[PDB]
């Protein structure tokens, strides 16, 4: 898998 | 009515830093549909990855894991611009859809969780128990991931304005510039936020000229 | 699992002095069943009515009503002996199921109370922001029907030691005793808790050979 | 105001049967002062220990013990007739000064408990997750100490009745009732519930002719 | 301790969008300090306003005022890589002293605010029972804020984007993009937040080759 | 309908 | 000590 | 005054 979603 | 059916925990995803970011709160009333808009951490990045948790604790490695899948084929882009929606929908019958959308691509995975996932009663007591036990613990941890995810954004904006800088920056100004990035850089792999805000506040402290030039040019 | 089945507000009973006697506790999950014994409050009461309240108020008048029914058949005796138990019975389907049954009799009656009978949605969320405007309120009205219950047990207990008593008890205290007892009776129909506090200590006071008596007796 | 000066904890006293009963609520903003009128459990009972507890839990031993005293010279009189009213009063210093005074007699005994007693900071967060992790628990022991001082009620008034019944009570009626008044004196020893509530039932189907004797002679 | 000095509302202030940000969460026990790291909304902006709020609601102007003060003397920079300290600091006394520090300047301004301002016991009971009231709309105003924020950012990096792309950037790309921003820079005017949704949704589908050129550039 | 029981 | 005092 | 703080 790969890098969580950020908040913007 | 007579019951309620309501939500006993809060459901929501993993978000940069390892931080549960809740879609559905602890005791709503389904059925339900929420959703929000997040985005790609890094430059270029092509997936990402929705990790389901419930529970009531701002660390996501506290809570239970309902599942992950990953949305792929998001297109070349700067970090922060991908639209990527997601939705928590749990219907008449307690079953939660999660689903996240690429607005560009319009690309969309999902994932179904059952009504019967997750914690038990017992689990689920011992979790409002434990969030509520640890309701300082937590407060530093979503502040430090605050700090860290700031310190982020300056690392990566000022190195994008280092290079449209170019040659308007002066020597000693890229020097200074840099050897902080790479100081912050060090500080951002920590737990401890003051070092971050001491790193952070260097690069406050060195990049003025950077920050006139970047204004001027805009 | 992601829903758990609970109470939005509590289920009880309307006991003497019109106060809410709570059963099954908000927030509780189903299935579940409780019971409790009661009793008459008065000598020789051959009925008790069983009024089935939702909500969070002290004053019963203040509850969502969900209905009523009749115990009878209850058989001659003093106030306080009678078992009249309630049980409070709520299914997997979230039906409601109320028994009162005489222990001495063997006499039972139910009501049973469909999933969508009481508050909806709206009315549940008033009621629970009501309960918590008017804690202060409520506390005061509970102190009273307590003080007022009370007065009621000592009026009437009272009375039966005088009978008890008879020539026994002094022409003096007798007078004074009877004259309290006129007191305590009107200002136990009243509302005003120091009052009624006022008229038992009087009752208090003047009662000391008479308890002496009483006490002697047994 | 920014802040409030509130109790982080319930405080009342322990009651019959080790349960702790509450005179100023959890949350309560100081100063207040609130009273409740209690009375004694046995016939010609001298005097009541006025324990004084902090926290949320049913059961007395559970609770922070705050001290306790003693209050005597109440007079010679049956169980529950004597008016103990117990005061909790706290100051604007956040001092609780607790008295027990005798109505009949006027007799008072304080506590004055400082400021700085009690659970600290950890204790009494421990104790709000302790109530909540033990709700069950302890709505079972409220439970069992309800029926408990029920049956010992139904035990006592039954023997008071008998007495003076004499006679009029048949040689088979008064039988049965004494060996239902011996099982149930028994199981009032145990912690089980549904036994006790055994023996009163039983109590209940043998004296339904001292019911009505009883209720005949007032 | 028998008393805990704890707030009776949350203390923060307001952010862009005019939400209420907390920095001192309701019930916290004092004395106490917690500070978090701001930014500016505009290119070149120089002076923040710190307007400091008590209460629950998230919409800013459902909250106590405390009072506001400027911070300025900001240098030059691009939006959001300001760093302004914002401290809330409540001392043994009840006294809340706010200061913001900007880390490049280290230019400071305070607020003292008396331990009796804000809201009485009245409006402090009202205020929780209006956040309680109102939770659902107070949360769709919490999700329009953050698809406003989001607009914004998008809205802005842009254009930025765009003015470092020139001539990379096709006629016909350029074209489409400045009509979809002009389009959701109306809708950041208004409360609708699909609308806003679906002209962030249009950017997104027009940009793809500015996002490749852009991550390209870096 | 009659009295509302009491607890005891 | 003695007994705890009974509610009524 | 001026434009309140954004949160980073």
Known sequence: SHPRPIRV | ?218
Request: glycine share 6%.
């Open chain 2, 1 to 218: 009515v007579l019951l309620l059916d309501v939500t006993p925990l809060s459901l929501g995803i993993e978000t940069m830093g390892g931080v549960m970011t809740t879609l559905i709160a602890k005791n709503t009333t389904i059925p339900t549909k929420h959703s929000q808009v997040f985005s790609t951490a890094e430059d270029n990045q092509s997936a990402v990855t929705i990790h389901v948790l419930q529970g009531e604790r701002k660390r996501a490695a506290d809570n239970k894991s309902l599942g992950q899948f990953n949305l792929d084929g998001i297109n070349p882009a700067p970090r922060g611009m991908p639209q990527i929606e997601v939705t928590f929908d749990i219907d008449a019958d307690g079953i939660l859809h999660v689903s996240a959308k690429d607005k560009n691509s319009g690309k969309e995975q999902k994932i179904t969780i059952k009504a019967s996932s997750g914690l038990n009663e017992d689990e689920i007591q011992k979790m409002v128990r434990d969030a509520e036990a640890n309701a300082e613990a937590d407060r530093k941890f979503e502040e430090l991931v605050q700090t860290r995810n700031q310190g982020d954004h300056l690392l990566h904006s000022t190195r994008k304005q280092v290079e449209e800088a170019g040659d308007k920056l002066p020597a000693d100004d890229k020097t200074a510039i840099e050897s902080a990035l790479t100081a912050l850089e060090t500080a951002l792999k920590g737990e401890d936020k003051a070092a971050i805000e001491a790193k952070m506040q260097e690069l406050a402290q060195v990049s003025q000229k950077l920050m006139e030039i970047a204004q001027q040019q805009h």
